Amino acid sequence: PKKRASNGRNKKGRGHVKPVRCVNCSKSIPKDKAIKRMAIRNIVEAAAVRDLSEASVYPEYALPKTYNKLHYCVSCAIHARIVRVRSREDRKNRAPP
Amino acid sequence: MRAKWRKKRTRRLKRKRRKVRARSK
Amino acid sequence: AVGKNKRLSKGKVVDPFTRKEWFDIKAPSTFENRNVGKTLVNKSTGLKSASDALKGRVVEVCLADLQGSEDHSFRKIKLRVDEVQGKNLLTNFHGMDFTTDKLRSMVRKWQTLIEANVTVKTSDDYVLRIFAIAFTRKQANQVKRHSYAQSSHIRAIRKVISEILTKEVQGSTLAQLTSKLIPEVINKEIENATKDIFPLQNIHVRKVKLLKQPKFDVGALMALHG
Amino acid sequence: AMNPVDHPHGGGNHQHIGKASTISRGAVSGQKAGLIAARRTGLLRGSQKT
Amino acid sequence: TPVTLAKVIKVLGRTGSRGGVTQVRVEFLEDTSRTIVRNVKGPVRENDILVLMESEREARRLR
Amino acid sequence: SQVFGVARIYASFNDTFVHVTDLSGKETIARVTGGMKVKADRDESSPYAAMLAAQDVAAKCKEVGITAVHVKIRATGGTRTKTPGPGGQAALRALARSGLRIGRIEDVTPVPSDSTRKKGGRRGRRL
RNA sequence: GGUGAAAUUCUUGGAUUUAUUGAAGACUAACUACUGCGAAAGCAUUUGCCAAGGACGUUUUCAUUAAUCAAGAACGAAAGUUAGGGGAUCGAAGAUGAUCAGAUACCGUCGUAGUCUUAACCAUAAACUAUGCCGACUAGGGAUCGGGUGGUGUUUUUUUAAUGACCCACUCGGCACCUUACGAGAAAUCAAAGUCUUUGGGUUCUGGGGGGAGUAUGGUCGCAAGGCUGAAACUUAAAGGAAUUG
């Protein structure tokens, strides 16, 4: 049967969507169907922050971060525990916590 | 078997029919 | 891998630190920190002419470094090695660029990006390709989430931007460009042109590439470095 | 198809060359029948590569 | 053999695939307030001194 | 006052390369990598090896005379993983605790617009 | 350098690498969404030109000209073919690293055809929303794209005009959505998959247990690959759909 109403993607009034590649497997998957997330991560990872602050040529340094979108396939996503499988009643929470 | 490969087997068989019947005709 | 290599030399010392000499590079008149840095180069034998072998270079340094200003932090200037006078060598403009972290911060969805490009000549014989980035924004008193434009607004924004670019650069020489881009008055010119179109925040500038300069004119460079 | 007097391939009860047709550049006038100063032969598949 | 004597001030939790090891937060005594988070094998508790043959490591996890 | 170099890190999976140079770049100093530090072909990417190289190049740069460095982080990008290995954090922690001074950290990973082609088949890498 | 780990391979002839240029081709990230357009396939830099289109507004015009359709024609992803070009990445085949009991399969390094394009062919796809086209009526709610109306509404230049961008309300048309379940259905589920045993608004196309078989033959189209049309004999009691517990 139709397991979903949108078939695991978002295609209405298109008929076609240009593809996207994953990053582990690099599988050609569409965009509306993908597991796009967003990595916004301080470059320093919260451990070396004290050392870099004290050793900075300039204090009051912003200490910028990596900003980038992360497209994942269903397989590698589920395997890397990004998402996980959901009950037949809670598949429909289209928003996150 | 898988339907696609069943199709491929059928096609190869079919074109072989083609060739043999060309040989006889 | 410390001990894996099957051959370091299929073909079958002096310390380069001692073989290298120091040099000290200064900015032009358009930036308050003239003295900006140093560099190294092998000792100028008659075989090599370290002067020219070093002349063929460029350096990116931050405008916060050159003006003390963390608001100017997000812009970097490439300054070309153009003159050398006995280890107090001098530069001139080569090209601007933002920081990718800044760009990746300002880019976000539920808004509309706009980008324009122009490939225009200046008053002083250079020919430069400048770009311009502008964003949309939810108005105050607005309630919608995205504030998407309607593409005719965008094409018009493109036209007015590009003609502003040509107008300015056609008449402003190189140093004048630097002097009016360090404050970025151009962005406020855009916003004052367009505030009857869209609120239009985050209207910064984008890279600029000398496509062909005139002759060096060491006299002009020294005039800058008076 | 000629006779061996008339060419360096001619002759034989079968039309066959016998001796390889890739000829040195430093051959002479009388031997330079065939593929001369050749680096490779056969069907080329790909690119002139220049 | 210059080593550093540093004290576990917190235990993060057990790891190894077999519960055989743990992760702990340890403060250097020399150069106080210099924290680290590192691994231990044996039975250990709070406040516990320990010699470390280096300072500059933090192994996140293990199986 | 303080003399400045630039750090030029490239934190690829399977290896975190570091090298330091003049502000221009052609004046290159002391390129070192994880595999230059350690043995295991898998540990080429080890952050341990990364910090090892960081301290060794710190020794080289202190004994040649640099004081500060402006950091330029890079990753594979282009077609490939686009995200750093652990040696990034490892090396910056290492030089921070080594004491050489720090400025102007920036990411220059090639994040190309409208790339050529992503490798590894359409179906993917069937690991 | 690659990996789960390794290995094939490149590195004093300086790889890998960093800086300044260059060339070739492809590509049009981020903005990019329960968002748009298009009959469908499909379409993502700018600018210019070519004609086109839907909706909207209309106290304009003609006047029943219309719907759906065999036959019959147009377009028709990828792959593939023909001759030229182009020819970077990627990569059917194939060689090799290996792992394996075996592995011409996965993973790895190479890599021709191809990938791109001009002219001409092919006429298929899970070409799926597996849901024909026209029309009407019926439960709510909200959000959104486009047009329009009204509202001293707000913000915008020169305080202030326009305009524009917002807010509110309404409206027509669109991509869809949240909830119910009156209704329906075998159930999943569905604002139609409803208004059907209280059986009829109009029309077209297809199916009649499973396989054989989308086979055979005959035409017909195509250079070919193959496509369109398309049975029978024989065999069989089940295959199959949706849900429940294990």
From Swiss-Prot, chain A:
GO MF terms held by the record: mRNA binding; structural constituent of ribosome
Annotated localization: Cytoplasm
Major site of localization recorded for this protein: cytoplasm
Entry GO CC: 90S preribosome; cytosol; cytosolic small ribosomal subunit
Superkingdom, taxonomy of origin: Eukaryota
One GO biological process term: maturation of LSU-rRNA from tricistronic rRNA transcript (SSU-rRNA, 5.8S rRNA, LSU-rRNA)
Protein keywords: Cytoplasm, Ribonucleoprotein, Ribosomal protein
Segments passing through the bilayer: none
Region listing for Disordered, in residue ranges: 1-19
Function, in words: Component of the ribosome, a large ribonucleoprotein complex responsible for the synthesis of proteins in the cell. The small ribosomal subunit (SSU) binds messenger RNAs (mRNAs) and translates the encoded message by selecting cognate aminoacyl-transfer RNA (tRNA) molecules. The large subunit (LSU) contains the ribosomal catalytic site termed the peptidyl transferase center (PTC), which catalyzes the formation of peptide bonds, thereby polymerizing the amino acids delivered by tRNAs into a polypeptide chain.
Other noteworthy facts: Present with 503000 molecules/cell in log phase SD medium. There are 2 genes for eS26 in yeast.
Family: Belongs to the eukaryotic ribosomal protein eS26 family.
Protein name in UniProt: Small ribosomal subunit protein eS26B
Organism per entry: Saccharomyces cerevisiae (strain ATCC 204508 / S288c)
Classification lineage: Eukaryota, Fungi, Dikarya, Ascomycota, Saccharomycotina
Range of the intact protein held here: 2 to 98 of 119
Swiss-Prot record, chain C:
Any one biological process term the GO annotation gives: translation
Residue span of region Disordered: 1-13
An example molecular function term from Gene Ontology annotations: structural constituent of ribosome
Repressor among keywords: no
Assigned GO CC terms: cytosolic small ribosomal subunit
Transmembrane segments: none
Compartment(s): Cytoplasm
Annotated positions of the N-acetylalanine modification: A1
InterPro entries per UniProt: Ribosomal_eS1, Ribosomal_eS1_CS, Ribosomal_eS1_euk
Keywords linked to the UniProt accession: Acetylation, Cytoplasm, Isopeptide bond, Phosphoprotein, Ribonucleoprotein, Ribosomal protein, Ubl conjugation
Biased composition (Basic residues): 1-12
Assembly and interaction partners: Component of the small ribosomal subunit. Mature ribosomes consist of a small (40S) and a large (60S) subunit. The 40S subunit contains about 33 different proteins and 1 molecule of RNA (18S). The 60S subunit contains about 49 different proteins and 3 molecules of RNA (25S, 5.8S and 5S).
Family recorded in the similarity comment: Belongs to the eukaryotic ribosomal protein eS1 family.
Name assigned to this protein: Small ribosomal subunit protein eS1A
Organism for this UniProt entry: Saccharomyces cerevisiae (strain RM11-1a) (Baker's yeast)
UniProtKB/Swiss-Prot annotation, chain D:
Superkingdom of origin organism: Eukaryota
Residues bearing the modification Phosphoserine: S47
Membrane-crossing residue ranges in chain numbering: none
Localization per Swiss-Prot or TrEMBL: Cytoplasm
Miscellaneous remark of the record: There are 2 genes for uL2 in yeast.
Function: Component of the ribosome, a large ribonucleoprotein complex responsible for the synthesis of proteins in the cell. The small ribosomal subunit (SSU) binds messenger RNAs (mRNAs) and translates the encoded message by selecting cognate aminoacyl-transfer RNA (tRNA) molecules. The large subunit (LSU) contains the ribosomal catalytic site termed the peptidyl transferase center (PTC), which catalyzes the formation of peptide bonds, thereby polymerizing the amino acids delivered by tRNAs into a polypeptide chain.
Subunit structure and binding partners: Component of the large ribosomal subunit (LSU). Mature yeast ribosomes consist of a small (40S) and a large (60S) subunit. The 40S small subunit contains 1 molecule of ribosomal RNA (18S rRNA) and 33 different proteins (encoded by 57 genes). The large 60S subunit contains 3 rRNA molecules (25S, 5.8S and 5S rRNA) and 46 different proteins (encoded by 81 genes).
Annotated family: Belongs to the universal ribosomal protein uL2 family.
Name under which the protein is recorded: Large ribosomal subunit protein uL2A
High-level lineage: Eukaryota, Fungi, Dikarya, Ascomycota, Saccharomycotina
Parent sequence residues shown: 203 to 252 of 254
From Swiss-Prot, chain E:
SUPFAM superfamilies, A to Z: Nucleic acid-binding proteins
GO annotation terms (biological process): maturation of SSU-rRNA; positive regulation of nuclear-transcribed mRNA catabolic process, deadenylation-dependent decay; ribosomal small subunit assembly; ribosomal subunit export from nucleus; translation
PROSITE patterns given in the database record: RIBOSOMAL_S28E
Post-translational modifications: N-terminally acetylated by acetyltransferase NatB.
Keyword Secreted: no
Residue runs in coiled coils: none
Keywords noted in UniProt: Acetylation, Cytoplasm, Ribonucleoprotein, Ribosomal protein
Subcellular locations according to the entry: Cytoplasm
Gene3D superfamilies (UniProt xref): Nucleic acid-binding proteins
Any single Gene Ontology cellular-component annotation: cytosolic small ribosomal subunit
GO terms for MF: structural constituent of ribosome
Note: Present with 94500 molecules/cell in log phase SD medium. There are 2 genes for eS28 in yeast.
Subunit structure: Component of the small ribosomal subunit (SSU). Mature yeast ribosomes consist of a small (40S) and a large (60S) subunit. The 40S small subunit contains 1 molecule of ribosomal RNA (18S rRNA) and 33 different proteins (encoded by 57 genes). The large 60S subunit contains 3 rRNA molecules (25S, 5.8S and 5S rRNA) and 46 different proteins (encoded by 81 genes).
Family the entry assigns: Belongs to the eukaryotic ribosomal protein eS28 family.
HAMAP family: Ribosomal_eS28
Protein name: Small ribosomal subunit protein eS28A
